[PDB]
Amino acid sequence: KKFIWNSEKKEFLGRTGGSWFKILLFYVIFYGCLAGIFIGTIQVMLLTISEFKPTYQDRVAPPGLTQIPQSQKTEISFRPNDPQSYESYVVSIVRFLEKYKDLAQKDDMIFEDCGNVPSELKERGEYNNERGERKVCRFRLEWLGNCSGLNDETYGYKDGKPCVIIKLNRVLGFKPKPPKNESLETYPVMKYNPYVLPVHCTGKRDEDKEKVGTMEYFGLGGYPGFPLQYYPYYGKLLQPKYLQPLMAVQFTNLTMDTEIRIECKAYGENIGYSEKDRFQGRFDVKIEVKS
Amino acid sequence: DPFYYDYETVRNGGLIFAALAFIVGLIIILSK
Amino acid sequence: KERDMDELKKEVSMDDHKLSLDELHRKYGTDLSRGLTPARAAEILARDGPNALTPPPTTPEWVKFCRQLFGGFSMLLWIGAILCFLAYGIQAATEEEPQNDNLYLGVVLSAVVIITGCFSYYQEAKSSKIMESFKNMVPQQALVIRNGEKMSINAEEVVVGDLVEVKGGDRIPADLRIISANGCKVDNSSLTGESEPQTRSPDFTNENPLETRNIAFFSTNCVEGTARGIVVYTGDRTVMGRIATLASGLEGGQTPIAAEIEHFIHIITGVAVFLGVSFFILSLILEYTWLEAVIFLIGIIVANVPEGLLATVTVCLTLTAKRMARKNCLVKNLEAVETLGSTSTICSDKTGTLTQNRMTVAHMWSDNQIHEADTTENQSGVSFDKTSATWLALSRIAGLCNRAVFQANQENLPILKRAVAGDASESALLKCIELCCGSVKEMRERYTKIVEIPFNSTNKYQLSIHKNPNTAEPRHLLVMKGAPERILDRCSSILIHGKEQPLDEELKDAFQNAYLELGGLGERVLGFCHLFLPDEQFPEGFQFDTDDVNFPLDNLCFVGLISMIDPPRAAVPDAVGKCRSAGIKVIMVTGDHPITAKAIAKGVGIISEGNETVEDIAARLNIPVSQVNPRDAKACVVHGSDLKDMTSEQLDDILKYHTEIVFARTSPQQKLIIVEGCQRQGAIVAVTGDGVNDSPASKKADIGVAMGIAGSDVSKQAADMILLDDNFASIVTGVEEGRLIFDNLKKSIAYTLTSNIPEITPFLIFIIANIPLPLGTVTILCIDLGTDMVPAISLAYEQAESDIMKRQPRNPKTDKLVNEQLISMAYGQIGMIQALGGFFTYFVILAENGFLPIHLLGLRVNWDDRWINDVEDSYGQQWTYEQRKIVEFTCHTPFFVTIVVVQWADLVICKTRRNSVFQQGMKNKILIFGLFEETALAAFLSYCPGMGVALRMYPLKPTWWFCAFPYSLLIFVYDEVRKLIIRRRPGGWVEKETYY
Ligand SMILES: *[C@@H]1O[C@H](CO)[C@@H](O[C@@H]2O[C@H](CO)[C@@H](O)[C@H](O)[C@H]2NC(C)=O)[C@H](O)[C@H]1NC(C)=O
Ligand SMILES: *[C@@H]1O[C@H](CO)[C@@H](O[C@@H]2O[C@H](CO)[C@@H](O)[C@H](O)[C@H]2NC(C)=O)[C@H](O)[C@H]1NC(C)=O
Ligand SMILES: CC(C)CCC[C@@H](C)[C@H]1CC[C@H]2[C@@H]3CC=C4C[C@@H](O)CC[C@]4(C)[C@H]3CC[C@]12C
Ligand SMILES: CC(C)CCC[C@@H](C)[C@H]1CC[C@H]2[C@@H]3CC=C4C[C@@H](O)CC[C@]4(C)[C@H]3CC[C@]12C
Ligand SMILES: CC(C)CCC[C@@H](C)[C@H]1CC[C@H]2[C@@H]3CC=C4C[C@@H](O)CC[C@]4(C)[C@H]3CC[C@]12C
Ligand SMILES: *[C@@H]1O[C@H](CO)[C@@H](O)[C@H](O)[C@H]1NC(C)=O
Ligand SMILES: [Mg+2]
Ligand SMILES: [Mg+2]
Ligand code: NA
């Protein structure tokens, strides 16, 4: 019963030739119309959204806090001697900071020198296209002291006492609001509370907090945070080649050959947190400089 | 702020809808 | 070596009954008048076994439970669960932090089979338990003569070779060899199928030990008289004992419904392995290693298995079996409910199944006119004219001159189904006078009997003289009855409307042709007459002792004839007409005489009027039967004597060229051979019987139908369906429901099979286009085992789109349950629109949050990664792991809602296979609730507090519920116009490709 392949009365794979043609023709017409219909409705869907703003932005309510060494498990384990042990980190740091060089930010028609001091927010009108392509405030590598250097093609970073910069999740129209001067016990920080979003790192428990000896923060003018002069974001279409603020953190007094946990928590009113997303607002890292 | 969605009103509406439709279906199968 | 044991049982029994009185006692070593000594009796008691059939083979309850966990469908779900744990074994040991999805599915697939097994087992067990309340096993003690003394002992305490005596009313214990009888008539109804009471004569009469009269049989009741006999066979070695053991050692076969389930699995797994393999190779060609490719193969093959379809199918069959039990038509088998719908050839028993197996007065001859009395079982027929004087004169002859009376508790019982003591003929007469002529209680005592003459061995006549109570004539009334040929010789006067006339040959030959008319109709006719004795010659004080000629035997006044025969049941003729109307070939298989079976077949519908047999054509042309061409005979009577000398090709030729066949005088084994001959044609066969001879016929048949009360227990246990009410029209209801559930099954299946396309397409393009997952696993379980459960069940409550009892029975080789058209529709067209409807909602949600569809290509690489918390969208926003995972789960929930939205239209279009929805109508209240419950449950699974915590199903923004609206309306309009062209153009294109 499974040799219905052919017969002298015309059957192939089960049916005749004329029948295979009729069915194939019908299915092609049917599926072609289905494709045209899905395309028409999806086109209506594309027309219900604008090019300058996403319709829904509440799923990104609390901005994240990422780092440069995008580790496989947010862990930094290497050898202070072996250069190939920390190659995966440095390569990513150089590739990330490759767009921050003084030669990359050279055009004066798309770049604007914000300033050496964090100032108030810079609102460049509304989000429509009535205005041309907005300007992006510059951010030179010199602001992150001791974690920038004037190295060659390879940024000779810190072997002992490594560096880990943090970055605030770029959100369209997001206006960061640092905490009020009535700081609810925010771990010694500078008095530049009004024009910079604070970010303070710490251990996680009585053990990690003791293992981590001294931390040194670096930012715009020396403040541990992100300046408000770089916000809000106006999308990639209106602001291409945009440079979000950066802030470096170096762990000087570390206990070598011991994995210790660090939590860099960003503070502010417009910065939420989440017990399910350890990256919303806060940020975790597991450092271990094994020699 | 545009970064907030009244999910509670929609959720409350979805549950009332899920309650009214179920009791109506129960009235449907009990034609008396 | 059981192959030889079954063959020595399929053979007709043999005997040594044809022996002289001296030789039998020499062979068995038994005294003819004293039996045997009690010690010799207990020796054969402890030698071979007590006189009782070996109990049936007990079926433990854990056996049939593990049976319901296996099968053909559950086997598919079992191999699927095995693939789930195998795929889980590969995923756990090879990658980091494995997900519990596949294992969550393996435990779910296993639970599906266990729950279905517990439910189906509760239903079949519930069917067997009520059957356990029907075994009214009443021990019956026999009268055995031993050591010259009569002793009443248990039936099991009887052995081989000893004298046994039976009384009129006593049931024959074992197979006896009659040695001395006296007007003893035994009831061979439940065994050989002989209707009228066959007398038992000590002398050997027929070679066949069955037709002979010197043999009493197991499970046969002595109607009247008494007789002696020597036990020949005992226990299982008896006649009906070997027949029962044969029924227990026969194969049930493969039901057609199960064959359709298996044929369904062949296609499901054929396309499942096709997609799994083609995508496995495509996956290895792209970039995925062998490690991930094997999981793709298993995931694609397993996801193509209808999980929720086993429960919907089992419940569908259960729902129909429920209506079977409502009308007292129990089915011990849950799937045998569909077997009647696929039936194309019914093999019915005559005595006990078609007929009532009870002698009843049929026709009467009065005033040279034939009057038909109501022979129905419920008295729902035309009543004869009961006002003339000839009827009163005849009714007194029958109601008075008869040895039949009612018993003690026979008061509240109906006039027909009540017990009556006496001969079968006298019982029919008493039940006719107690029903049409008032009552026989005060009518019998109204005429004080003086001298009676019982039935004689020769010139069988029964007469009696009574006093006259009329307030006009004091002349004694003498009544007499007998055979028409015996009473014609003892009469000269004739009654007509009250007055008398001579024996003129003009009306005398008119009585003779009426005698041949009621006789040729297969009935038994008796002649009744009465005469007024002269009170001037025989005064009121003269005693006419029964010695010499005190009453004039001749010159009597004949009133009329009275015929009688076992009539068919009430709803039997119309039911036969309904089965032949649907196109089922009806063939009577019985062991009765051909003279009565031919008439019953003509009276029930098996033999149509006008159609002639091979013998009727020969009788019409006054030529020998060997001249006519059997092709000129539409119907034909097959005698059992000639069936013994036949091959398989000859039986095939009898069944092909003859539409109306009646097998008469066929042994139980021959009934089995006839059933096998009909199955050789490849047609579905249903056998309906009542006696033990029908046990091997109801067991081997695809389905056996037994009577709940008028049928023996053996044939009742070997059958697959029991008629508790014995109403034969239940067969018509069974075939109707059997075809209706089959079509509702096609609908219920195409419904669950349509949802497979949008359940698998997300995972397919997930691998193809490298896009994030559009539909999760938990969300798929909420569709197959959640929302769609009620619509698939409510789809069973559907009615007929036309007249099902008008179309012809399905062809097992052509009309399959799941053909290539159903797949062309569900998997090809409808499921296709549902899959595109899901992807639309998917892109809508992603594009409105910032992830345009064009930006979603190749994004799953950094999307499913748990540590890249800065995945860029189309607007440049950076999304962490849980933010975008929150969007993906709130993108799976609306995909699930999209499935429900398109299932609205899919349920409405699968609801009707040919007619428009406006034609059939949404009157199915369970289907309306199937939609309300589906919608409320879908909204509840998304908006309940904690759904994103337990099932990862976040609430939906109210704008997503309308993303799938145009697709559902499209599905509805396209299928409606499809059914419309099927209506206006029923030729071939729109009907042979889409109509399933
Ligand atoms: C950046 O690194 C330099 C070393 O290259 C640090 O310079 C040392 O600073 C300490 C005081 O903290 C002096 O006592 C040493 O003499 C300095 N050494 C050299 C070689 O300059 C410098 O402090 C670091 N900058 C910051 C902000 O920590
Ligand atoms: C840097 O950390 C070291 C510990 O690794 C500190 O020095 C230790 O001080 C304790 C007393 O509290 C001594 O018992 C250890 O022997 C010291 N170890 C070494 C290597 O000196 C040191 O004080 C820290 N320095 C700063 C600036 O935080
Ligand atoms: C084809 C038609 C007749 C089916 C009728 C049912 C339709 C109209 C119903 C079924 C489910 C319904 C949705 C149920 C749940 C939600 C969330 C709630 O907080 C707002 C109402 C909203 C958005 C409803 C819109 C209308 C809706 C889609
Ligand atoms: C991921 C992508 C590339 C897979 C595309 C699969 C498409 C092209 C396949 C899947 C199922 C197929 C159909 C399966 C059922 C039928 C009915 C049959 O008697 C003829 C083949 C026909 C008409 C096929 C046409 C092509 C089809 C729609
Ligand atoms: C021939 C005619 C009937 C078909 C017309 C197509 C209609 C029914 C389709 C085409 C595009 C569809 C709309 C596409 C865009 C939006 C915005 C979205 O977030 C919700 C779905 C919604 C609201 C759809 C509703 C139904 C819609 C208007
Ligand atoms: C906050 O308060 C301190 C003193 O408590 C003061 O020196 C500082 O200027 C204040 N800053 C603002 C922004 O008010
Ligand atoms: Mg019978
Ligand atoms: Mg499924
Ligand atoms: Na069977």
C-alpha–C-alpha distance, residues C613 and C615, integer Å: 5
Q: Collect all residues with Cβ–Cβ distance below 8 Å to A158 and sequence separation of at least 6.
A: A146, A147, A250
Where b means 16+ CB within 10 Å and e means fewer, A159-187 reads: bebbbbbbbbbbbbbbebebbeeeeeeee
Q: Collect all residues with Cβ–Cβ distance below 8 Å to C701 and sequence separation of at least 6.
A: C253, C347, C675, C685, C686, C687
List the single residue in C925, C928, C932 with the smallest CB-CB distance to B22.
C932
Amino acid letter for position C791: P
List the single residue in B12, B22, B29 with the smallest CB-CB distance to C925.
B29
The two three-digit tokens of residue C185, written as one number: 């008539």
The two three-digit tokens of residue C896, written as one number: 């699930």
DSSP 8-state class, residue C571: T
C-alpha–C-alpha distance, residues C76 and C306, integer Å: 9
Domain C68-121+259-322+737-805+812-992 has CATH 3.50.50.60: no
The two three-digit tokens of residue C525, written as one number: 């006719």
C-alpha–C-alpha distance, residues C104 and C938, integer Å: 21
Report resolution in angstroms. 4.6
User: What CATH code is carried by the domain that includes residue A60?
Assistant: 2.60.40.1660
Number of domains in chain B: 1
Question: Residue A59 is part of which domain span?
Answer: 50-291
C-alpha–C-alpha distance, residues C663 and C670, integer Å: 9
Check: CB of residue C722 under 8 Å from CB of residue C328. no
First CA to last CA across chain A, in angstroms? 73
Q: Collect all residues with Cβ–Cβ distance below 8 Å to C691 and sequence separation of at least 6.
A: C189, C190, C191, C192, C193, C349, C351, C352, C711, C712, C715
C-alpha–C-alpha distance, residues C299 and C19, integer Å: 77
Query: Of C201, C221, C219, which Cα lies nearest the Cα of C211?
Result: C201
Contact (CB<8Å) A237/C873: no
User: What CATH code is carried by the domain that includes residue A41?
Assistant: 1.20.5.170
Check: CB of residue A163 under 8 Å from CB of residue A146. yes
Residues A94 and A169 in one domain: yes
Q: Collect all residues with Cβ–Cβ distance below 8 Å to C173 and sequence separation of at least 6.
A: C51, C140, C142, C155, C158, C164, C166, C218, C231
C-alpha–C-alpha distance, residues C111 and C564, integer Å: 62
Q: Does B5 touch chain A (CB under 8 A)?
A: yes
Region C360-565: CATH code: 3.40.1110.10
Specify the 3-state DSSP secondary structure of C909: helix
Beta-bridge partner residues of C561 = C527
Chain Cα centroid distance, residue A140? 18
Please tell me the experimental approach by which this structure was elucidated. Answer: X-ray
Cα nearest neighbour of A171 on chain C: C877
Contact (CB<8Å) A277/C880: yes
Specify the 3-state DSSP secondary structure of C35: strand
| Range list of H helices, C546-679 | 572-582, 594-604, 614-621, 640-643, 648-657, 668-679
C-alpha–C-alpha distance, residues C158 and A32, integer Å: 85
Q: Count CB atoms within 10 A of the CB of residue A139.
A: 20
* C585-589/C345-348 β-pairing: parallel
Q: Collect all residues with Cβ–Cβ distance below 8 Å to C703 and sequence separation of at least 6.
A: C255, C336, C339, C340, C343, C686, C687, C719, C720, C721
Most C-contacting residue of B3, B6, B20, B22 (CB-CB within 10 A), to test interface: B22
C828 pocket-lining for ligand 4 (C-beta < 6 Å): yes
Check: CB of residue C600 under 8 Å from CB of residue C355. yes
Most A-contacting residue of B3, B6, B8, B11 (CB-CB within 10 A), to test interface: B3
A193 pocket-lining for ligand 6 (C-beta < 6 Å): yes
Determine phi and psi for C637, rounding to 5 degrees.
-100, 125
Chain C residues 939-968 with a CB less than 8 Å from chain B: 939-940, 942-945, 955-958
C-alpha–C-alpha distance, residues C155 and C140, integer Å: 6
C-alpha–C-alpha distance, residues C574 and C316, integer Å: 29
Choosing among 3.50.50.60, 2.70.150.10, 3.40.50.920, 2.60.40.420, the CATH entry for C2-45+138-248 is 2.70.150.10
- The angle at the Cα of C70, spanning C65 to C76, to the nearest 5 degrees, equals 150
Structure-token match 């089965």, residue found: C579
- The angle at the Cα of C763, spanning C757 to C768, to the nearest 5 degrees, equals 110
Number of domains in chain A: 2
C-alpha–C-alpha distance, residues C908 and C911, integer Å: 5
DSSP 8-state class, residue C458: S
Query: Of C152, C163, C160, C150, which Cα lies nearest the Cα of C46?
Result: C160
C-alpha–C-alpha distance, residues C969 and C983, integer Å: 21
First CA to last CA across chain B, in angstroms? 53
Q: Which residues of A touch C957 (CB under 8 A)?
A: 56
Amino acid letter for position C589: V
Residues A33 and A54 in one domain: no
C498 pocket-lining for ligand 5 (C-beta < 6 Å): no
Question: Residue B25 is part of which domain span?
Answer: 1-32
Query: Of C217, C332, C334, which Cα lies nearest the Cα of C722?
Result: C332
Residues A195 and A273 in one domain: yes
Ligand 5 site-directed mutation target among C965, C968, C974, most atoms within 8 Å of CB: C965
Check: CB of residue C478 under 8 Å from CB of residue C551. yes
Check: CB of residue A71 under 8 Å from CB of residue C867. yes
List the single residue in C850, C880, C970 with the smallest CB-CB distance to A54.
C850
Check: CB of residue C680 under 8 Å from CB of residue C700. no
DSSP 8-state class, residue C210: T
Question: Ligand 3: which residue has its CA nearest to atom 19?
Answer: B13
Residues A29 and A59 in one domain: no
C-alpha–C-alpha distance, residues C343 and C329, integer Å: 17
Query: Of C721, C788, C829, which Cα lies nearest the Cα of C927?
Result: C788
C-alpha–C-alpha distance, residues C104 and C965, integer Å: 32
Burial of C98 (0-12, 13-18, 19+ CB in 10 A): middle
The two three-digit tokens of residue C964, written as one number: 């799938």
Residues A13 and A155 in one domain: no
Residues A42 and A182 in one domain: no
Q: Which atom of ligand 2 is nearest to the CA of A255?
A: 5
Burial of C974 (0-12, 13-18, 19+ CB in 10 A): middle
Residues A27 and A92 in one domain: no
Residues A89 and A144 in one domain: yes
C-alpha–C-alpha distance, residues A33 and C94, integer Å: 44
Give, for C233, the enclosing helix (H) or strand (E): strand C220-233
Query: Of C47, C41, C51, which Cα lies nearest the Cα of C162?
Result: C41
Query: Of A61, A100, A178, A239, which Cα lies nearest the Cα of C879?
Result: A61
Q: Collect all residues with Cβ–Cβ distance below 8 Å to C503 and sequence separation of at least 6.
A: C491, C492, C493, C494
CA distances from C5 to A218, C243, C244, C715 (A): 99, 13, 14, 21
C-alpha–C-alpha distance, residues C412 and C393, integer Å: 29
Flag whether C374 is marked binding: no
Determine phi and psi for C261, rounding to 5 degrees.
-65, -45
Using N-to-C axis directions, what is the helix angle for C73-94 and C256-286, rounded to 10°? 20
Enzyme catalytic residues of C: 349
Q: Count CB atoms within 10 A of the CB of residue C471.
A: 6
C-alpha–C-alpha distance, residues C202 and C197, integer Å: 16
Using N-to-C axis directions, what is the helix angle for C730-754 and C831-849, rounded to 10°? 30
Domain borders along chain C are 2-45+138-248, 68-121+259-322+737-805+812-992, 360-565
The two three-digit tokens of residue A160, written as one number: 């002992």
The two three-digit tokens of residue A9, written as one number: 């009365």
* A65-67/A163-168 β-pairing: antiparallel
C-alpha–C-alpha distance, residues C42 and C276, integer Å: 72
Sign of torsion over alpha carbons C619, C620, C622, C625: negative
CA distances from C311 to C324, C438, C742, C749 (A): 20, 59, 16, 11
Determine phi and psi for C139, rounding to 5 degrees.
-65, 135
Chain Cα centroid distance, residue C498? 52
Check: CB of residue C515 under 8 Å from CB of residue C561. yes
Using N-to-C axis directions, what is the helix angle for C831-849 and C965-984, rounded to 10°? 160
Check: CB of residue C942 under 8 Å from CB of residue C950. no
Residues A41 and A110 in one domain: no
Contact (CB<8Å) B4/A174: no
Structure-token match 């025989």, residue found: C538
The two three-digit tokens of residue A171, written as one number: 């959100």
C-alpha–C-alpha distance, residues C228 and C166, integer Å: 7
Number of Cα atoms under 13 Å in the Cβ half of residue A120? 2
Check: CB of residue C341 under 8 Å from CB of residue C348. no
* C660-664/C585-589 β-pairing: parallel
The two three-digit tokens of residue B29, written as one number: 């199968």
Q: Which atom of ligand 2 is nearest to the CA of A214?
A: 28
Contact (CB<8Å) C836/A38: yes
C-alpha–C-alpha distance, residues C390 and C558, integer Å: 10
Q: Which residues of A touch B4 (CB under 8 A)?
A: 58, 61
Q: Does C902 touch chain A (CB under 8 A)?
A: no
Distance C86 CA to ligand 5 centre (A): 44
Query: Of C326, C335, C320, which Cα lies nearest the Cα of C737?
Result: C320
Check: CB of residue C369 under 8 Å from CB of residue C568. no
Sign of torsion over alpha carbons A83, A84, A88, A91: positive
C-alpha–C-alpha distance, residues A213 and A254, integer Å: 6
C-alpha–C-alpha distance, residues C736 and C636, integer Å: 29
Structure-token match 């440069």, residue found: A68
**Could you tell me where the beta strands, DSSP code E, fall in C609-768?**
635-639, 660-664, 685-689, 703-707, 721-723
